[model samples]
Target: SKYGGECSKKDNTCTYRKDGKDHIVKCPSADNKKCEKDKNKCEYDDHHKTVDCQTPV
Candidate 1:
């Protein structure tokens, strides 16, 4: 619960699944290291809950 990352090579796209339902989040232009400069960014959107993480130090 401290960091987030895209589901790479996984069968999930951070989509919500409540009894077979989907709810997405709205977080465009993630704060990535390439996008930022301090750290690498990771995000996951599931069940309308979006989380972004940047490695500190």
Candidate 2:
């Protein structure tokens, strides 16, 4: 299943909004600061470098 829409995993930049809030801003940075649970929660395609988006619990 999908949780978020198209987003840049490189710099964690996205124009998409969830509940009128910027999803990107809630995401972690390139340095993996915010997405501390990436290793466990994040899901990405093999072709993608980082997670396209985070899965909402």
Candidate 3:
């Protein structure tokens, strides 16, 4: 499969789900600071294991 992306209502957060669970990734500073708003333009690091968004973006 390929990577997918989603964002929060205020565009300040994101969601990436896998392994039957959901993970919420909040922006580091502001709405436009962390992840890219465009789903197609979003970036992420994929792994078979779990990961955290300590510094989302």
The positional error of residue 12 in candidate 1, measured at the CA in angstroms, is 16
RMSD of each: 8.0, 10.5, 6.2
Q: Tens digit of lDDT per residue, candidate 1, span 1-57?
A: 222543222222232234455433333345441223322334543455554433234
lDDT of 3 at 14: 55
Q: After superposition, how far is residue 43 of candidate 3 from its true place, in Å?
A: 4.7
Q: Give the lDDT of residue 16 in candidate 1.
A: 28
Write down the worst ten-residue block by lDDT for model 2. 37-46
- Please say which candidate is ahead in lDDT: 1 or 2: 2
Off by over 4 Å in 2: 1-4, 17-26, 30-52
- The TM-score measured for candidate 3 stands at 0.42
Evaluate residue 52 in candidate 2 and report its C-alpha lDDT on the 0 to 100 scale: 41
Model 1, 9: alpha-carbon shift in Å?
16
**What TM value does model 2 have?**
0.25
